[PDB]
């Protein structure tokens, strides 16, 4: 209010404004969420009733990571306001892929590794993001670091079946499409396979339900056999046939990853 200098609207991008924290000129994003539009609510450690998004953001925002950090939040009469970290300079991964086309595998490896580490961090914090996609990934173009955003479709991580989902349908697995259910981890691995294909091919593999359930991955771009193999494994139709995060990260295609700064110097600067 007096704490923040409010700049322009960032980015059908909800209501997120550029901001500067007054105390120390920190770049922030100021995200407004209408109470009437929130379906999932939770309670904080002290029983303050808040949107689930706030609960999940607090759980992941302790320490450094590839997750955007919630710095503060406020309740207003008809909304919640969320103060989030803002890297600068930044571009989201969707626009990056649109402008550059299919990524070199070296770059895709670095990015994909970082998303994997970020999603492991969420899972270690008891959080399932449920909307892993290029649009929800920011690239810090100077540091070469990726940041996961928008926990508005997320849930507490659990080992039992999920029967609700409001993420992005084209990144959702066939068990969701066909049966209206999924397990968190295996569904996340499906969406990571869609993302990896998107990176190395320049667009997602499936647009329609029939393609999602079909179990057929055609490569439009030149992609190494090892990368093709990892993608097809992540997109196994049967959830139990998909790799664990450990198996992904030990896959031959994932060896010799660049550091974020190396990535920035080679591909972004």
């Amino acid at each position: 209010e007096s704490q923040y200098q409010v700049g322009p609207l960032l980015g059908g991008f909800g209501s997120v404004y550029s901001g500067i924290r007054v105390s120390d000129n920190l770049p922030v994003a100021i995200k407004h969420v209408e109470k009437d539009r929130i379906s999932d609510w939770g309670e904080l450690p002290n029983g303050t009733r808040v949107p689930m998004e706030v609960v999940l953001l607090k759980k992941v925002s302790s320490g450094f990571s590839g997750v955007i950090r919630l710095l503060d939040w406020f309740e207003r009469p008809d909304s919640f306001v969320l103060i989030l970290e803002r890297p600068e300079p930044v571009q989201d991964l969707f626009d990056f892929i649109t402008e550059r086309g299919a990524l070199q595998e070296e770059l895709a490896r670095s990015f994909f590794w970082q998303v994997l580490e970020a999603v492991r961090h969420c899972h270690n914090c008891g959080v399932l993001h449920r909307d892993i996609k290029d649009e929800n990934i920011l690239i810090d173009l100077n540091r070469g670091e990726l940041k996961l955003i928008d926990f508005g479709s997320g849930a507490l991580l659990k080992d039992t079946v999920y029967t609700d989902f409001d993420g992005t349908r084209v990144y959702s697995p066939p068990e969701w499409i066909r049966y209206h259910r999924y397990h968190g981890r295996s569904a996340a691995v499906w969406s990571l396979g869609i993302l990896l294909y998107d990176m190395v091919c320049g667009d997602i593999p499936f647009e329609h339900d029939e393609e999602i359930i079909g179990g057929q991955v055609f490569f439009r771009q030149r992609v190494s056999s090892e990368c093709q193999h990892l993608i097809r494994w992540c997109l196994a139709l049967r959830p139990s046939d998909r790799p664990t995060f450990e198996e992904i990260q030990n896959h031959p295609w994932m060896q010799d990853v660049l550091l974020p700064q190396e990535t920035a110097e080679i591909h972004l600067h």
């Binding site: 059908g12 969707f94 892929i97 409001d166 993420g167 992005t168 320049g202 647009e207």
Partner: peptide, 8 residues
């Protein structure tokens, strides 16, 4: 096929 965003 146009590359497009997809809402949640």
């Amino acid at each position: 096929r146009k590359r497009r965003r997809h809402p949640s």
